[PDB]
Structures are given as C-alpha cells and as structure tokens.
Design a protein around this ligand. Structure first.
Ligand SMILES: O=C(N[C@@H](Cc1ccccc1)C(=O)N[C@@H](Cc1ccccc1)C(=O)CO)OCc1ccccc1
Length: 215
C-alpha cells in the first residue's frame, strides 16, 4: 500500500457535521461513507441525508442507535438503492427525537448497489482504503471526551459504541496513525477530526469496518 493517504485533500470528503442530542452516529457514519464512494465513482461531491435513515430506516432505532450494515442493507432492500440529498431531506433530529418518516417530496442524490464488510485487520483495511476510499468503522469513544489534538495514545478499547469514518492513514509518521471524521462539530479535535495510533487496535477500530458499493 502507499505509505500515506489523505482523502480530505483529494475532493472526496464533505464538511464536518453535528449529530446534536440524537444517538444518530450510525447514520452519520453510513452517509459519510456513501458521499465519498459516490464521488470516487466519478459523480459530483454531493451532500446526502442522514435524516432519511434516522426517520425512515425502521431496521435501526432512530435517536436510540443503529448499525451501519443495517443501514446499507435498508437502502438497497427497502429504498431501491436511493440516498436523498441533504437539501431535499434536511437534518431534523438535533433536539434528540426522530420525527415521522416523509415518503415523498425528496430528490435522489446517490444510489448504491450493496456493501462489503472488511477484514478485522488494520493493514488490510488500509490497503482497501488506499484504492477504494473512506471506510465506515465503529469505535469505543469513551476516551474521546478528553481528546484535544495530536495522535492519541492509550485509547480505552473495551466496547464498541460510536460510528465514524476513516478518511486516511500515515505509516511514515513517528507513530503511524489513522485519520477519522467525527460528528461533534469542527470546534472538537483537529477541526472535527481525530488521529489515533495505527497497528494496536486502538479504540477497537479494526472490529466493524465496512463500505457501500457504488456501481
Ligand atoms: O447502539 C447501537 N449502535 C451504536 C453505534 C455502533 C455501530 C456499530 C457497532 C457498534 C456500535 C450507536 O448508534 N451509538 C449511539 C449512542 C448514543 C445514544 C444516544 C445519544 C447519544 C449517543 C450514537 O449516537 C453513537 O454516537 O446500535 C444498537 C442497535 C442495534 C440494532 C438495531 C437498532 C439499534
């Protein structure tokens, strides 16, 4: 694999978001992945709708939580592969509730055909990311309320609880690291990003990695 990859500088990653008081990290992870995969398939970089998942994907639990793989499966099996634009289905859950699903009045911004579940191996995830783009992952975020910048050390790695998006890595650095997009505003971390050490399963980052497939 290349020594380093950073998709943020290559036109593939939209702005950092704010999930607010809702337990919707799963939806930010899944949609951020779709956004990146759609661009890398040769389509314009488009802002897509987390609200579609939070209100309409009844195989997940709204502001009480969900799974990225369930969300990818719902899009294809129940929603004809469609992912609506942000502008046509804007985020409505920042106060912490999921309003009833709206089943018309939206415009499709992207489509997917399926998803892949990646190996539980950091070198294999990096190799896939270098060619095919950003990857949805789950982490233990319990230590992330202390992060202020730099490459974090000694991440608490006990229980997966938070969905996020891998956007790059650097194996040439003094301590090799992953680059991760969070959904806690740009005032948190490094303009909304976190770097964690790579190669020691920090925060359980290798355990639940997956991606949508765009045809
Ligand atoms: O708890 C979750 N998911 C986790 C993420 C996850 C994804 C993949 C693997 C492990 C964890 C989840 O959604 N976490 C929630 C936790 C939360 C709840 C309420 C307020 C703020 C925060 C998040 O928003 C993560 O920030 O899913 C429960 C579930 C399972 C099946 C169907 C419906 C919900």
């Amino acid at each position: 694999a290349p020594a380093a990859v950073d998709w943020r500088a290559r036109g593939a990653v939209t702005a950092v978001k704010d999930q607010g008081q809702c337990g919707s990290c799963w939806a930010f992870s899944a949609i951020g992945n779709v956004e990146c995969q759609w661009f890398l398939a040769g389509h314009p970089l488009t802002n897509l709708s987390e609200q579609m998942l939070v209100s309409c994907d009844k195989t997940d639990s709204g502001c009480s939580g969900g799974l990225m793989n369930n969300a990818f499966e719902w899009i294809v099996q129940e929603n004809n592969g469609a992912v609506y634009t942000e502008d046509s289905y804007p985020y409505a859950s920042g106060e912490g509730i999921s309003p009833p699903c709206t089943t018309s009045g939206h415009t499709v911004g992207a489509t997917i055909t399926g998803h892949v579940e990646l190996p539980q191996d950091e070198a294999q995830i990096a190799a896939w990311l270098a060619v095919n783009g950003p990857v949805a992952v789950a982490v233990d975020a319990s230590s992330w309320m202390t992060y202020t910048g730099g490459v974090m050390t000694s991440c608490v790695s006990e229980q997966l609880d938070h969905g996020v998006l891998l956007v790059g890595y650097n194996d040439s650095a003094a301590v090799p690291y992953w680059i991760i997009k969070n959904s806690w505003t740009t005032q948190w971390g490094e303009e909304g990003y976190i770097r964690i050490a790579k190669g020691s399963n920090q925060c359980l980052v290798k355990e639940e990695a997956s991606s949508a497939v765009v045809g």
